[PDB]
C-alpha cells in the first residue's frame, strides 16, 4: 500500500493509493474515469520508460509518493 | 542529395530522430571532438550516415550502391533500436513515441546529452484559491499543451488546472534559466502558427533559431523537416525512397508541429 501521483502534461497531479503487487491496470482505469479520458488514448511512463497495465509497483521498484507521467497517446508509425 | 532511412515496420518514430540528429551542426562538431570517438554510438551514427550519403552522391553499380546504402543505414538504425529496446520494451512492429525515445537515446552518452539539457522552472499561481509553486527542473525535452495564443520561448505559458481547487484555465509558465546549445520542445497540439522565424529568441546574449521540426502527420506518421543553409527545407519522409525531398518554404500545418528543435547560432 503506497501513494502514487499521476502527473499530466497540463500540470495536473492526482494522487492514488495502491498495493505494491497490485497491477497498475486498476490505477490507469481509475485515472481515465476521473479525467474523462479514454484508456486507449493515453500512455503512462515511469522513470522515463513506458509502463503496461500488467506491471505492478513491485516490478517497477516504485517507492511511495513516486510520480507516474501521463500523456495523450501520440505514437507511430502506421504500416 | 540527402539520403534517408526507408520505412521498416513501425520505425518512423526512430527514423525521425535519426534524421534530426545527423543534420545537427552542433552535434556533428561535438562528435568529432570526442575522446574515444569510435566508442560512441553517436559517432557511429554520424559516420555511417555520412558514408551512405557519400554513396548517394556517387550514384548520380546502381544495384550495388543502393544495396550498400540500405545495409549501411539499416545497421546503425538497428543498433540504436536494440539499445533502446530494453527501456521501451518494444518490437519493430510496436508504435512508439519519439517524445519517449529521444530523451532515453540522449541519456546513453552524457557528453552528447549535455548538448540538450536545459534548466528552467515551472511557475504556477491560481487566481481562485492562491495555490502557487515554482519547481526547478533540468530536462532535454519538455512537453507543452494548451499554449497561450502568444506563446513564445521567452513567454512560454499554457493553460492548466489548479491541483488545489480544480479551477480550470489557470496559467502555468516555463521560465528558462540556462539554455543548452540544442533546445527542444514537444507541442501536443502544435504551435499557434507555423511561421517559425517568429519563435527565434535571444537568451543571455545568444541567438536561438529553429533548425528542424518533427511533423506528426495525420496523427500516425512522423516526418522530419530540416532547414538547409540556403533557407530551403528538406523533408525526410521514410515512405519516399532513399532521397529526401527539397521544399522552398516549410509546409507543415501548425497543428502538426510535434517536436521543435532550436540551436544556438553565431
Ligand atoms: Zn486553485
Residue numbers in the entry:
A (entry chain C): 17 to 95
B (entry chain A): 225 to 284, 296 to 501
Task: Please share excerpts from the published article on this structure.
USPL1 is a low-abundant component of the CBs that plays a role in the RNAPII transcription of snRNA that is essential for cell growth.
In order to get insights into the interaction of USPL1 with SUMO, here we show the crystal structure of the complex between human USPL1 and the human precursor of SUMO2 at 1.8 Å resolution. The complex between USPL1 and SUMO2 was prepared by taking advantage of the formation of a covalent bond between the SUMO2 C-terminal glycine (Gly93) and the active site cysteine of USPL1 (Cys236), which stabilizes the complex, increases the binding affinity and thus the chances of crystallization. The electron density maps clearly show the covalent bond formed between DHA93 in SUMO2 and Cys236 in USPL1, in which the sidechain and not the C-terminal carboxylate is crosslinked to Cys236 Sγ. The final electron density map model of the USPL1 catalytic domain includes most of the residues (Ser225 to Ile501), with the only disruption of a disordered loop connecting two alpha helices in the thumb subdomain (Leu285 to Lys295). A Zn2+ atom coordinated by four cysteines stabilizes the structure of the finger domain, as occurs in several USPs, forming a zinc-finger motif (ZnF). SUMO2 is grabbed by the USPL1-like right hand in the complex, with the C-terminal tail of the SUMO2 precursor extended towards the catalytic triad of the USPL1 active site formed by Cys236, His456, and Asp472. Interestingly, a major difference in USPL1 is the lack of two loops in the palm subdomain, namely so-called blocking loops, between strands β6 and β7, and between β8 and β9 next to the catalytic triad. Arg324 is engaged in a strong well-oriented electrostatic interaction with Asp71 of SUMO2, with 2.7 and 3.1 Å distances between the NH1 and NH2 of the Arg324 guanidinium group and the OD1 and OD2 of the Asp71 carboxylate group, respectively. The only specific side-chain contact is engaged by Asn398, located next to the Zn2+ site and conserved in all USPL1 orthologs, which forms two hydrogen bonds with the main chain oxygen and nitrogen of Gly27 and Ser28 in SUMO2, respectively (2.8 and 3.0 Å distances).
